[PDB]
Swiss-Prot record, chain B:
Name this polypeptide is given: DNA-directed RNA polymerase II subunit RPB9
PROSITE patterns to which the protein is assigned, alphabetical: RNA_POL_M_15KD, ZF_TFIIS_1, ZF_TFIIS_2
Keyword terms, alphabetized: Acetylation, DNA-directed RNA polymerase, Metal-binding, Nucleus, Transcription, Zinc, Zinc-finger
Gene coding for it: POLR2I
GO molecular function: DNA-directed RNA polymerase activity; nucleic acid binding; zinc ion binding
Annotated compartments: Nucleus, Nucleolus
Protein residues bound to Zn(2+) 2: 75, 78, 103, 108
Family: Belongs to the archaeal RpoM/eukaryotic RPA12/RPB9/RPC11 RNA polymerase family.
Zinc fingers (C4-type) by residue: 6-31
CDD domains in alphabetical order: Zn-ribbon_RPB9 (cd10508)
One cellular-component annotation, GO: RNA polymerase II, core complex
Keyword Ligase: no
Binding site for Zn(2+) 1: 6, 9, 28, 31
From Swiss-Prot, chain D:
Transmembrane segments: none
Residue range from the parent sequence: 5 to 180 of 517
Entry protein name: General transcription factor IIF subunit 1
Modified residues (Phosphothreonine): 114
Lineage of producing organism: Eukaryota, Metazoa, Chordata, Craniata, Vertebrata
UniProt family annotation: Belongs to the TFIIF alpha subunit family.
Domain of life per record: Eukaryota
Curated annotation (Swiss-Prot), chain F:
Portion held of the full protein: 2 to 150 of 249
Localisation: Nucleus
Disulfide cross-links: none
Entry similarity comment: Belongs to the TFIIF beta subunit family.
Source taxon at top rank: Eukaryota
N-acetylalanine modification, residue list: 1
Gene: GTF2F2
Residues carrying Phosphoserine: 126
GO molecular function: DNA binding; RNA polymerase II general transcription initiation factor activity
GO biological process assignments: positive regulation of transcription by RNA polymerase II; transcription by RNA polymerase II; transcription elongation by RNA polymerase II; transcription initiation at RNA polymerase II promoter
High-level lineage: Eukaryota, Metazoa, Chordata, Craniata, Vertebrata
Native species: Homo sapiens
Descriptive protein name: General transcription factor IIF subunit 2
């Protein structure tokens, strides 16, 4: 029915315990970065004006989609390997994720023809 | 007090006097438009400005949940017992302590001060 | 307290309640109805304002409480204005018995017959309410 | 009579295409524009290009009448639209979509200070008096 | 000064990329609002409030010399950080500043000048109410004002 | 005689027109079924001191909308057109203004979500990649 | 979503009104951009709050502030606004009932959690600006009791007043029994301790 004053002390700590079970304490850091990668990183790439180049052939570069791989480390031999944070702390590595962007290149040579090529995951 | 705008260019009308007849005229600058003035007063300022906050108080404050309510001051126009009371809220009020009341009843924007 | 009143800097801005600039060329028909009863007393025996006077007129209202608190009356204030500006400003004022202290200002006859006749009243008003010291 | 309590219902009709596109032209309440005195009127694009997305100029009775500049409404309503409904004798409303909205402001017609004259008179701002004199001189 | 003390307090706008703050009415003129009514309707929403009216009087008198949008744009451009070698460059420069640099959150499209005039009208209105004491001044420490 | 001349017959005949604001989905269905000419019916009722208007959408097109009327004295609005033949005309003056909204509200919040969902689909987000690009 | 929704609620766009209408209507601002004006701010605010509590079109972190004496409604959807959860109070009664506590006790093997309290409209996030418009009960056991009659219009209630303390300040026992400079010195020493 209703929370009586004798149960409120127990009731409010249940509500708060459920808050910290869900959100935790560092939620501001984690949610701020999640939004940055998921949304801000993509908005910046789409908002940037397409590169237009003129000699006279005309070239246009349109950045189109961002992909972000799991944090990966490349050994001296060049073999990529998923980097565990403990390895990053131990080996003084930088815990970084490779960032890729799809790019579509279109070129016009005033010959009523356009060539469109897409560089996937550049 | 009242401000007049030129009917031709909607610019401000400024006070003028016709040396030919010595009557106040509201003449438009940059427009050669003139109007026969009727107020005869070109400027007035109140230094003590004892204006009543009742003119400034808005009837919608009756909806503010943070304002206190009293049953001891029933509205004169509707008899509603609950009223919302608060202070001046204007910096020009050198003695901003008196209480202004507003009727809590809907559509009754009556305001008064004790 | 009398010494305090003589020491404290007092300017017309402290004693005036409100002020307004009117246009009334005929003093025998003051735009302010209340002034007609007392202004005609001066125009019954005019001096330095017989021949001409500026139709533009500045009216000031003085708070009886502020005036009496400072032990000031319209008499020395009018004299102080004429002492500071000379006869350039014809100062005319109602009797102390009036419900409100009122003073009327017009530019001298020879100036009407020094920057301007109309807007200059705002300079005078603002100057009287700022730099003039009673 | 029944006019005080009349009730009517009319079918709504929306033509698929029209030879003339419908636009809204709004004027400020203080302009008190009157169409009876508009013996002639012109609506045309501005000359600043000397175009499809540029201001419009409205002139009435040639040069003798009032002049106005029409500006397109910048804020579009991606989720809302406007339609004009007109009374018809056949008992059905014809609705036209508002293709464009233009707000018109009057343009004063007088010898406004040119850029050169304003540049000249600007120095007076430091000590100008009796502004009427500046227009009487000009 | 007698002339200055007679007009009193006046409003100036410190626009971006401009060396000296321009009179506020020049910006409304530059945005294309010609008559004082067109400008005041954006600053004073209740003409029956003579106190606000007396506050804008000196701002109008200072800008009186500039009665044309192109003249206002030329004036703004003349004070720009990049002085235009010609009136057309000055107007285009001033137009670019008002189009993109001033109040970008309100809009940057060619027809957003109406929204910028209302917001600039509101900025002046807020300044008038503060000077008239009808609203309390904003507090820098208030976390509602922080991000 | 000029390309910019407007045919004022709409104004000369004092053609009065009603300006109505409607949702894009509502107008989208009307535009889709525009060729039918049977998008719905508009009902108008007036009383001694009150009046009400509402629109009912055709069942086949949906597979009551009361109108909120607004005064026209606050701003003078007019309707004009541009012909494909490069000839302008003035159709009339807005004598009444209203906005169309459905009678129901709770289900409308759902329909708004439906429109919002369709409008959100183009919002591209950075995709996580399981394996590095070789 | 807010701007699109406000168009349905008769908010008049600035470019579609005469300045004479700005006198009585309330200004609606979104992220500080003046979007338009509205003639019935009370019904609008009630609708915005109802949608936010139901999470229909407005997310939990959007704050709506109505400045009654200023005829302004400000809606902030921008980032960086600090906010905190508060229990909602209606008709001087908490919206939180024993059914919610029982469901929260049975948190595991039930998947009921904090997100269900927010979705149920039982608790909502109040930012520092909206807090100015809020009348906040410190505790339901004493602040909203009809006998106190201090205020009969509480809008929200604190969950627990100790949640005003931080991480290091939450480690002090009985901080309400210590001189305020001593709580500050401990907050610093707690970071310098060993464990
Ligand atoms: Zn004029
Ligand atoms: Zn009442």
């Amino acid at each position: 029915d209703e929370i009586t004053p004798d149960l409120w002390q127990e009731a409010c700590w249940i509500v708060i315990s459920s808050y910290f079970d869900e959100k935790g304490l560092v939620r501001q850091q984690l949610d701020s970065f999640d939004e940055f990668i998921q949304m801000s990183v993509q908005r910046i790439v789409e908002d940037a004006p397409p590169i237009d180049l003129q000699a006279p052939p005309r070239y246009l570069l349109k950045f189109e989609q961002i992909y972000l791989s799991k944090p990966t480390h490349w050994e001296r031999d060049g073999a990529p390997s998923p980097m565990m944070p403990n390895e990053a702390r131990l080996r003084n590595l930088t815990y970084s994720a490779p960032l890729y962007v799809d790019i579509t290149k279109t070129v016009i040579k005033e010959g009523e023809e356009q060539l469109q090529t897409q560089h996937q995951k550049t | 007090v009242g401000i007049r705008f030129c009917q031709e260019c909607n610019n401000m009308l400024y006070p003028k006097e016709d040396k030919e007849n010595r009557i106040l005229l509201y003449a438009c600058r940059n427009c050669d438009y003139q109007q026969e003035a009727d107020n005869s007063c070109i400027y007035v300022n109140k230094i003590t400005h004892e204006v009543d906050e009742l003119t400034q108080i808005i009837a919608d404050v009756s909806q503010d949940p943070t304002l206190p309510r009293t049953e001891d001051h029933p509205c004169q126009k509707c008899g509603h017992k609950e009223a919302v009371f608060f202070q001046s809220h204007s910096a020009r009020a050198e003695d901003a302590m008196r209480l202004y009341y507003v009727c809590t009843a809907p559509h009754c924007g009556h305001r008064w001060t004790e | 307290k009398d010494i305090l009143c003589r020491l404290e800097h007092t300017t017309l801005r402290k004693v005036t309640a409100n002020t307004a600039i009117y246009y009334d060329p005929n003093p025998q028909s003051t735009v302010v109805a209340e002034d007609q009863e007392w202004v005609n007393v001066y125009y019954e025996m005019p001096d330095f304002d017989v021949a001409r006077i500026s139709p533009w007129l500045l009216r000031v209202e003085l708070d009886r409480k502020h005036m009496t608190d400072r032990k000031l009356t319209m008499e020395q204030i009018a004299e102080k204005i004429n002492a500071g500006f000379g006869d350039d400003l014809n100062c005319i004022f109602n009797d102390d018995n009036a419900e409100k202290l009122v003073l009327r200002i017009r530019i001298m006859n020879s100036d009407e017959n020094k920057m301007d006749d109309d807007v200059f009243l705002r300079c005078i008003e603002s100057n009287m309410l700022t730099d003039m010291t009673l | 009579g029944p006019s005080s309590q009349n009730v009517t219902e009319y079918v709504v009709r929306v033509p698929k295409n029209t030879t003339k596109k419908y636009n809204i032209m709004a004027f400020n309440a203080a302009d008190k524009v009157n169409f009876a005195t508009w013996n002639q009127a012109r609506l045309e694009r501005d000359l600043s290009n000397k175009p499809e997305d540029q201001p419009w100029l409205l002139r009435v009775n040639g040069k003798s009448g009032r002049k106005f500049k029409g500006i397109k409404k910048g804020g579009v309503t991606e989720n809302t639209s406007y339609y004009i409904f007109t009374q018809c004798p056949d008992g059905a409303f014809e609705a036209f979509p508002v293709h464009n909205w233009y707000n018109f402001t009057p343009l004063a017609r007088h010898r406004t200070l040119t850029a050169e004259e304003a540049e000249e008179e600007w120095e007076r701002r430091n000590k100008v008096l009796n502004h009427f004199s500046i227009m009487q001189q000009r | 000064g007698a002339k200055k003390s007679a007009i009193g307090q006046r409003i100036v706008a410190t626009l971006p990329y401009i060396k000296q703050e321009v009179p506020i009415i020049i910006v409304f003129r530059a945005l294309g609002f010609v008559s004082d009514r067109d400008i005041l309707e954006h600053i004073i929403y209740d003409f029956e409030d003579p106190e606000m009216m007396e506050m804008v009087k000196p701002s109008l008198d200072e800008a009186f010399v500039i009665q044309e949008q192109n003249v206002a744009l030329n004036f703004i451009g003349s004070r720009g950080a990049k002085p235009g070698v010609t009136k057309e460059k000055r107007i285009k420069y001033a137009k670019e500043v008002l189009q993109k640099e001033m109040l970008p959150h309100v809009g940057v499209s060619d027809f957003c000048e109406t929204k910028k005039a209302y917001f600039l009208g509101y900025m002046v209105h807020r300044l008038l109410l503060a000077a008239l004491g009808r609203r309390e001044l904003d507090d820098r420490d208030h976390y509602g004002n922080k991000r | 005689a000029e390309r910019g001349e407007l045919d004022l017959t709409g104004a000369k005949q004092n053609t009065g027109v009603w300006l109505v604001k409607v949702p894009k989905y509502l107008s989208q269905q009307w535009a889709k079924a525009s060729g039918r000419g049977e998008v719905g019916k508009l009902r108008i009722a007036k009383t001694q001191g009150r009046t009400e208007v509402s629109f009912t959408l055709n069942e086949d097109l949906a597979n009551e909308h009361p109108f909120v009327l607004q005064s026209v004295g606050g701003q003078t609005l007019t309707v004009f057109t541009e012909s494909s033949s490069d000839k302008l005309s003035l159709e009339g003056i807005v004598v009444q203004r209203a906005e169309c909204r459905p009678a129901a509200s709770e289900n409308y919040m759902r329909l708004k979500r439906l429109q919002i969902e369709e409008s959100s689909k183009p919002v591209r987000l950075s995709q996580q990649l399981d394996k590095v690009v070789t | 979503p807010i701007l699109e929704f406000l168009e349905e609620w008769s908010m008049e766009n600035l470019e579609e009104i005469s300045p004479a209408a700005i006198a009585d209507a309330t200004k609606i601002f979104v992220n500080g951009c003046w979007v338009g004006i509205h003639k019935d701010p009370e019904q609008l605010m009630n609708t915005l709050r109802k949608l936010r509590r139901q999470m229909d079109i407005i997310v939990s972190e959007v704050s709506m502030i109505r400045d009654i004496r200023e005829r302004e409604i400000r809606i902030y959807t921008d980032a960086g606004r600090i906010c905190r959860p508060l229990l909602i109070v209606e008709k001087q009664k908490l919206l939180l009932k024993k059914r919610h506590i029982d469901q929260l006790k049975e948190r595991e093997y039930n998947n009921y959690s904090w997100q269900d309290l927010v979705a149920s409209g039982v608790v909502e996030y109040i930012d520092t600006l909206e807090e100015e418009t809020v009348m906040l009960a410190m505790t339901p056991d004493d602040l909203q009791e009809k006998e106190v009659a201090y205020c009969s219009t509480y809008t929200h209630c604190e969950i627990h007043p100790s949640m005003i303390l931080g991480v290091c300040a939450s480690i002090i026992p009985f901080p309400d029994h210590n001189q305020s400079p001593r709580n500050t010195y401990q907050s610093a020493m707690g970071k310098q301790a060993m464990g």
